[PDB]
Amino acid sequence: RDDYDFLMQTSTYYYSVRIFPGQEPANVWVGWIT
Amino acid sequence: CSGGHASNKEKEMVTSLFCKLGVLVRHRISLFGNDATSIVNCLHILGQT
Amino acid sequence: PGQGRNNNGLEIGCVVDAASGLLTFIANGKELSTYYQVEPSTKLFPAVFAQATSPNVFQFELGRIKNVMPLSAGLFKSEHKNPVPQCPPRLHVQFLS
Amino acid sequence: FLQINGYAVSRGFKDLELDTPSIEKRFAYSFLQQLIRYVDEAHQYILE
Amino acid sequence: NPQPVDTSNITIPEKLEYFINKYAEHSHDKWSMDKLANGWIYGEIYSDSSKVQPLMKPYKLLSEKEKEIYRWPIKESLKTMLAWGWRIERTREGDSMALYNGYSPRAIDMSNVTLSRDLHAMAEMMAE
């Protein structure tokens, strides 16, 4: 289990993208934009 | 303007068809059994084409 | 590994270090080589560019992993200390047009 | 599954070449040509 | 007249045989989860009336006969495919896949994956 104090002090954020099977992932790009 | 015009040889061969159809219809309206009018109209539309 | 999208849906996880500006990506539980470094005060929008080759294209998951606080905490100021992932109505997909 | 393992199956025989520059295969070409053949045949028919 | 294209003359290759083995693995897998969904009881004795059977064992473990009764229709399938003259090419990424060679046995979303139109027409002619 991750430390709750660590979760409180950290600033790193996460998300995810699930490419559904059969969707050609070469045609899929994931990341951040401004 | 969509495209697909007749070729030069197409035009040549159409004109040759015209000439030979005129030769065919020349002095043969009596030989044609009242279809001479049909050939007349044929050569007509050929002339406008 | 190859054919990761075949057996199961492929999962790309994007982690951003707002304190240092490091952007890293983890696919199938291992951190990919490509990483980015952004200058301070940058606003980064989660984004996916996809050419649909299937009726179902993809899925944004707003979950969280070990030692990383979920995206809603970063987005909303009220939930800055809420470990529970959230998808409030303000968050929504926008497409370029 | 063939697609999954990446095996591409294609047509049994690829086309060797299409003589599109040669205008003999035009629909007007062959049709009007047979038209001329029948016209000439009927012309010599009526000459007889 | 109900006649297909005879194909007894052609022989199957081995690079195609690896694909055949993988697709027979898939056939066994979906058959196994078909039995799980239906509720066939796991037991050494095989009785259809009692619904008991022992064949939920993995493909490599699986009986060679069962592997063979998958492989056979697959063999005549690729055999007729070659009788149609259709050439088959293994991609280099696919070759790398064979070279490379919890734990949930998961099938493949056949409906979600998509096929090209020419291959659709090939699917229709082979179906007929």
CA E119 to mean position of chain CA atoms? 18
Nearest in space to C61 (alpha carbons), one of C28, C29, C85, C77: C85
Under 8 Å between Cβ of C37 and C18: no
Euclidean distance between CA atoms E17 and E78, whole angstroms: 10
Q: Do D36 and B31 touch (CB under 8 A)?
A: no
D residues 1-48 lying closer than 8 A (beta carbon) to E:
1-13
**Sequence letter at residue C19:** A
Euclidean distance between CA atoms C64 and C47, whole angstroms: 17
Q: Do D8 and E91 touch (CB under 8 A)?
A: yes
Parallel, antiparallel, or unpaired: how do β-strands C30-37 and C45-50 relate?
unpaired
Q: Would you say how long chain A is, in residues?
A: 34
Under 8 Å between Cβ of A22 and E114: yes
The SS3 assignment for A32 reads strand
Residues paired with residue A33 on neighbouring β-strands, in sequence order: C45
Nearest in space to E112 (alpha carbons), one of D3, A22, C4: A22
List the structure tokens of E15: 């690079």
- Say which experimental method was used: cryo-EM
- B21 torsion bin: left (phi>0), alpha (psi -120 to 50), beta (else): alpha
Nearest neighbour of C3 by CB, restricted to E97, E106, E113: E97
Under 8 Å between Cβ of C76 and C62: no
End-to-end CA distance of chain E: 12
**HEC assignment per residue over C8-45:** CCEEEEEEEECCCCEEEEEECCEEEEEEEECCCCCCCE
Phi, psi of C14 (to 5 degrees): -100, 125
Euclidean distance between CA atoms E125 and E128, whole angstroms: 5
Contacts with D5 (C-beta within 8 Å, 6 or more apart), sequence order: E19, E22, E90, E94, E97
Size of interface A-E (CB pairs under 8 A): 13
Tell me the chain D residues in contact with residue B16 when contact means C-beta distances shorter than 8 Å.
Answer: 36
Token look-up 């007249």 returns: E1
Work out the number of other CB atoms within 10 angstroms of the CB of residue E113. 19
Under 8 Å between Cβ of E112 and C11: no
The SS3 assignment for E99 reads helix
Euclidean distance between CA atoms A29 and B27, whole angstroms: 80
List the structure tokens of C93: 């997909």
Q: Do A15 and C70 touch (CB under 8 A)?
A: yes
> Resolution (in Å) of the shown entry?
3.5
Residues paired with residue C59 on neighbouring β-strands, in sequence order: A18
Nearest in space to C71 (alpha carbons), one of C91, C41, C57: C91
Under 8 Å between Cβ of D6 and E96: no
Contacts with E120 (C-beta within 8 Å, 6 or more apart), sequence order: none
Q: Do D9 and E19 touch (CB under 8 A)?
A: no
